[PDB]
Each structure stands twice: as C-alpha cells, then as structure tokens.
Amino acid sequence: MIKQRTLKNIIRATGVGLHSGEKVYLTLKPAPVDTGIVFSRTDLDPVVEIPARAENVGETTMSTTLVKGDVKVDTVEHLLSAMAGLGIDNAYVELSASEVPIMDGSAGPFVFLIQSAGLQEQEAAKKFIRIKREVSVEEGDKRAVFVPFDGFKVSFEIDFDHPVFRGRTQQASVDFSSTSFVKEVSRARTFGFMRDIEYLRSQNLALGGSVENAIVVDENRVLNEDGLRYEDEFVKHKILDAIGDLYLLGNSLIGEFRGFKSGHALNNQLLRTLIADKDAWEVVTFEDARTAPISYMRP
Numbered sequence: 001m002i003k004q005r006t007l008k009n010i011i012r013a014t015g016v017g018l019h020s021g022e023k024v025y026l027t028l029k030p031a032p033v034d035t036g037i038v039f040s041r042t043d044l045d046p047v048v049e050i051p052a053r054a055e056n057v058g059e060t061t062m063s064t065t066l067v068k069g070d071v072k073v074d075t076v077e078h079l080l081s082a083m084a085g086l087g088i089d090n091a092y093v094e095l096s097a098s099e100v101p102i103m104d105g106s107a108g109p110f111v112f113l114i115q116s117a118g119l120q121e122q123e124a125a126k127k128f129i130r131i132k133r134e135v136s137v138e139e140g141d142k143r144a145v146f147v148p149f150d151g152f153k154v155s156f157e158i159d160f161d162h163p164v165f166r167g168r169t170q171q172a173s174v175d176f177s178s179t180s181f182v183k184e185v186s187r188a189r190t191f192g193f194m195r196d197i198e199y200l201r202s203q204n205l206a207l208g209g210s211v212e213n214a215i216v217v218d219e220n221r222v223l224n225e226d227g228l229r230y231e232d233e234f235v236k237h238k239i240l241d242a243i244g245d246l247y248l249l250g251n252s253l254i255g256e257f258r259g260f261k262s263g264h265a266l267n268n269q270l271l272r273t274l275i276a277d278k279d280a281w282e283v284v285t286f287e288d289a290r291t292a293p294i295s296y297m298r299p
C-alpha cells in the first residue's frame, strides 16, 4: 500500500522571514498517523496550534498566511510545497516567530532538510483526493481550475509587469509522473521587480529580502550575479507556490491544476470551492502502490 509518511527525526533550521525580516527558529517534528501538518507558534504563551488547512488561511496578498484569532503564521507555501513534493502527511512545524524562514527563496533547502532527517513510512494508508469533475474559479483575467486527471499535473501561465525576456508572459506544464518535483521545481526561487521592491520596502514589507533569497529584476534584466537556475524559473516558482497552497486541502490531489495569472488568493478560493462541491471529489487509498497514479520516492 501507499503509506502515510512523517520524519524519522526532529530537525532544525534557522533563517529570516522574507516579509518580516525577523530571525526565526524552525523545528520539524515527527507526528503520528492522521495528524496532518500542524504549525505552532512557540514564542507565545500559551503556544498556539494552527492546522495547515484551507479554512485557516487569512491573508493572501504577500504570501499564504494561516490565522487563528490575532495569531498568524506567514509564508507557509514553500515549506508546504516541499512536504507535498516528498509526500509528508504528518508533521509538527514549530516556529519562534510569525513567519516561516525564506532560506534561499525556493523549496530546495526544505526538501534537503527533510531528506537529511529521513522519511518514515507509517502503517496506515495515505489518503488522496481525486478530482471527479472540473471545478474552476475566476476573477477578471485570473483563473484557477481543477480538471480530472489520473495522476498529478500542474500548468501555469503568468503575465509580467513588463516585458521580461521579450515576452509579457511565461508558461510551463509539469506532469509529476515523468518529471520529479525535486529536479524540476524545488529549486525555483521567488522573485520581484525592482519597481515593486522599492514600493514594498517603503511600506516596511519584504524586509528579509536579498539577492541571496530572491531573483531581482530591474525592469528586464536579472540583477543576481549568477543568473537563473531554470530558464523559466519565474513560472516554475508559481508552480511551486500552487503545490504548497493546494496542500492546504490536507491530502494529496489526484488531478490537474491549471493556473492563469492565479496567486495565493485565487488558489485558496479554488480550494474553498472544491471543498464545498462535494460531488466533484472523493477520498481514495491505494492498497497496491504498483497500480497507483502517483508515485513517491523510496523513503
């Protein structure tokens, strides 16, 4: 059977929040069967727990934020994309500040941290959500869609502001059956245009941002000394964010996601519409991994 997975050991990372600029201690702790991903704010009394669920999504302007009252956990998507990518179902994520550290701006360091701690397969079937019918949400020219597909596939098209590498747009499609999350997506870094960055910094935002954790483009030129990790790194990072945002469903998806100039807000609205449309999905387990439509790497 395709089993649930957690970490073999507790592992720690240190970093800075992209938006808050605050130093943060990150602890990933193994968790038992059917826990899901649960975040906790350890710098607070009492300690506040926030399950990584679509219903707990608050702000979506700068990154995906989880909320419980006045308590927030900011920028959960890169860490969640790394967990989705590796098939981590159960884990405690303990943070000493509101924001998850940005690391190098990609899911790469989180994927390596998880693999360094080692994966632990658990004696219970991993639950998947199968897309049975198409579900879509739109707002103006933005669109996010789930389409039935026997596996997991992500397509994304973005519009720039503008234009970058002779194009006003960038597109990429990743079918996770033939292409691995680790190889083709995990290393794609977050990005910002200098004109936007100057505005964000003037408003005390993007405080932890630097060329060490973000691609900076001054109009049409990448300013980072060593350039890009992928020719289409921008759209690959949007795919990385969509995977993380989609993981807030609480279980891995069997289906195809298509994003058209979609961000954190519309990604969460798509999840809310899918959850509400119970006839469009069903929970499925695979007692035989050999015939399952999604494959995870050996533990």
Ligand SMILES: CN1CCN(Cc2ccc(C#Cc3ccc(-c4cc(C(=O)NO)cnc4-n4cnc5ccccc54)cc3)cn2)CC1
Residues within 6 Å of the ligand: 061, 062, 063, 064, 077, 078, 190, 191, 192, 193, 196, 197, 200, 206, 209, 210, 211, 214, 215, 216, 223, 241
């Ligand atoms: C000449 N130097 C170059 C180095 N500078 C320092 C520097 C370097 C990088 C940054 C930065 C940044 C940054 C800000 C926001 C994002 C961002 C991340 C996510 C994200 O990854 N979510 O997962 C989503 N949206 C983002 N975003 C980018 N532009 C935006 C404009 C408006 C709103 C949000 C915006 C990414 C990088 C700031 N200062 C000083 C001048």
Ligand SMILES: [Zn+2]
Residues within 6 Å of the ligand: 077, 078, 190, 237, 241
């Ligand atoms: Zn991102």
